[PDB]
Amino acid sequence: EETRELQSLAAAVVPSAQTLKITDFSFSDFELSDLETALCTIRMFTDLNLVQNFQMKHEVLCRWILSVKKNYRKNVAYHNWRHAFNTAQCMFAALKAGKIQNKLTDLEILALLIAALSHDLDHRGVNNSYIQCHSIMEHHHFDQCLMILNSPGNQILSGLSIEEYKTTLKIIKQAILATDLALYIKRRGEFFELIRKNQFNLEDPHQKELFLAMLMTACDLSAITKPWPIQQRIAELVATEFFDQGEKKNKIPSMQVGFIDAICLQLYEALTHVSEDCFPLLDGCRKNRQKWQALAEQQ
Numbered sequence: 001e002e003t004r005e006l007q008s009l010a011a012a013v014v015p016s017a018q019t020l021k022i023t024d025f026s027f028s029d030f031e032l033s034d035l036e037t038a039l040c041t042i043r044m045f046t047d048l049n050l051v052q053n054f055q056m057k058h059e060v061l062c063r064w065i066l067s068v069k070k071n072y073r074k075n076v077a078y079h080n081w082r083h084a085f086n087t088a089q090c091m092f093a094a095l096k097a098g099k100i101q102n103k104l105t106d107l108e109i110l111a112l113l114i115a116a117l118s119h120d121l122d123h124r125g126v127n128n129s130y131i132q133c134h135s136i137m138e139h140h141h142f143d144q145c146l147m148i149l150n151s152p153g154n155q156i157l158s159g160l161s162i163e164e165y166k167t168t169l170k171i172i173k174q175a176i177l178a179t180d181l182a183l184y185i186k187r188r189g190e191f192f193e194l195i196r197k198n199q200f201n202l203e204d205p206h207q208k209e210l211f212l213a214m215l216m217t218a219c220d221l222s223a224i225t226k227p228w229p230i231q232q233r234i235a236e237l238v239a240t241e242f243f244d245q246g247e248k249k250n251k252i253p254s255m256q257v258g259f260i261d262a263i264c265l266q267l268y269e270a271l272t273h274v275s276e277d278c279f280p281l282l283d284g285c286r287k288n289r290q291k292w293q294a295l296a297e298q299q
């Protein structure tokens with residue numbers, strides 16, 4: 001069946017980005033089959049000029065995508081392939097519609113897309129954090145990412161020179177490590193402070209790296225920015241994994257507001273300053289806060 005899935009994917013035509021709706025910040029994957037998410041992923045690499053600029057063979061990219069998808073656990077309610085897929089779609093949208101693409105190099109864009117898709121590989125559920133803060137989980141996710149990138153027939157970075165390769169792996173590693181909320185909390189102050197004093201400069205290597213980390217977090221948490229009906233469903237999945245280990249929702253509203261205020265709002269507000277075109281993420285996050293708050297006050 002696996003080889004059958006690869007055949008089907010490899011031979012299928014890839015619809016335009018417009019048709020796949022991957023340029024929209026409000027994108028949802030609920031109506032898509034796994035095969036369709038694989039197609040959207042190919043379009044992301046294609047439209048970001050990655051397939052061309054790095055000479056990726058169609059057969060290899062397809063196999064790599066399927067290996068990545070296969071290495072997420074479907075039995076985990078939220079931290080699964082759909083989450084990684086959505087994180088990558090948000091990166092694509094931020095780069096295109098958010099106009100962030102022009103602010104980065106091709107290697108950085110290549111690393112960001114790969115990281116987004118690979119950032120939660122082999123996640124076993126928040127409650128099943130069984131071992132055998134240096135973000136131990138993120139290190140495992142990266143290890144899985146590297147293993148797949150080095151698997152025979154899955155080497156989508158074979159077209160890069162060794163120097164490009166080492167640079168890309170480093171960015172990929174930092175990007176995945178950045179998805180550790182402890183690191184976000186630890187580094188956001190500097191980012192907020194720089195934007196505050198209007199001293200933010202992407203030309204500065206340290207600030208460029210800091211920005212890449214913040215962007216990863218923004219895409220990682222982007223479910224919190226989706227249209228209300230979508231966000232409710234995503235929150236339902238997170239709740240399932242967190243509680244149902246896969247009162248009740250009488251506390252979810254307040255916790256959602258707590259999460260939005262403590263982690264999300266500031267980040268999307270900062271992102272909008274760096275690029276006004278990313279406003280929809282902030283707008284969606286604000287609309288969901290209002291909705292959750294109304295419920296928290298008992299509707």
Ligand SMILES: O=c1c2ccccc2oc2c(Cc3ccc(O)cc3)[nH]c(-c3cccs3)c12
Nearest residue numbers: 181221223224234235238239242252255256259
């Ligand atoms: O993603 C996270 C999250 C990630 C890492 C660590 C903690 C996190 O907490 C999140 C919440 C708070 C929450 C509140 C009530 C629940 O039943 C479940 C979760 N909502 C979310 C949601 C994320 C996106 C839409 S809702 C949370």
Ligand SMILES: [Mg+2]
Nearest residue numbers: 119120179180
């Ligand atoms: Mg993670």
Ligand SMILES: [Zn+2]
Nearest residue numbers: 119120179220
């Ligand atoms: Zn994640």
